[PDB]
């Protein structure tokens, strides 16, 4: 179930 | 693979770049930009009031289609 | 061991079962991880938690070097 995410800014 | 920007509005309307999409049309619209390249980076942006249920529905549609390179933009 | 960060609909926050705020979250997390920044963090939230709140939490982790994030639905 997990969705790996990067945060970008 | 130019990255794709998926935007969710406060009224839960959704866009791939400038293209309005729904849950039922998102992957077809995305595949036109990516040419099926699942390694294309997808950047998610949303209005502050968009809720986690909505975010995760979008995330799951991408995930099940094999789009796994996701960046959240704040 | 992975760490579960929970956000409730009133925006109260937990690391495991431990209540945290923005100002105390990294100290609480470091007690669990012993500073291992490669520790997996799973984020869970009630359905009505908003994107602003999510990204505030994400940014606090990010600036502290916690970059292994999984969103749980």
Author numbering:
A (entry chain C): 43 to 51
B (entry chain A): 61 to 134
C (entry chain B): 62 to 134
From the primary publication:
Active nutrient uptake is fundamental for survival and pathogenicity of Gram-negative bacteria, which operate a multi-protein Ton system to transport essential nutrients like metals and vitamins. One of the key systems involved in this transport is the Ton system, which forms a multi-protein complex embedded in the inner membrane. This system utilizes the proton motive force (PMF) to physically open a variety of outer membrane transporters – the so-called TonB-dependent transporters (TBDTs) – and, hereby, realizes active transport by means of the inner membrane proton channel-forming complex ExbB-ExbD and the periplasm crossing protein TonB. Here, we study the periplasmic domain of ExbD, a crucial component of the proton channel of the Ton system. We show that this domain is a dynamic dimer switching between two conformations representing the proton channel’s open and closed states.
Herein, we initially hypothesized that TonB/HasB might bind between the two protomers of ExbD, effectively replacing the NIBS residues at the dimer interface. This idea was driven by our observation that the NIBS residues unfold upon addition of TonB/HasB, implying a potential competition between the NIBS residues and HasB/TonB for the same binding site. To investigate this possibility, we solved the crystal structure of an ExbD construct lacking the N-terminal residues 43-60 (ExbDEc, ΔNIBS) in complex with the corresponding TonB peptide at 1.5 Å resolution. The crystal structure confirms that the IDR of TonB undergoes a disorder-to-order transition upon binding to ExbD, replacing the NIBS residues in between the two ExbD protomers. In this arrangement, the TonB peptide forms an intermolecular β-sheet: A parallel β-sheet with the β6-strand of one protomer, and an antiparallel β-sheet with the β6-strand of the second one. Corroborating these structural observations, AUC experiments of ExbDEc, peri and the TonB peptide confirm that ExbD retains its dimeric structure in solution upon binding to the IDR. Upon encountering HasB/TonB, this open state is conformationally selected through the binding of HasB/TonB into the groove between the two protomers, which was previously occupied by the now-unfolded NIBS. This would mark a critical first step in the activation of the system. The open state of ExbD is selectively bound by an IDR of the partner proteins TonB/HasB, which undergo a disorder-to-order transition as they bind between the two ExbD protomers, as evidenced by X-ray crystallography. However, we showed that the transition between the open and closed states of ExbD operates at distinct rates in these systems: on the slow NMR time scale (ms) for the single-target Has system and in the intermediate time scale (μs-ms) for the multi-target Ton system.
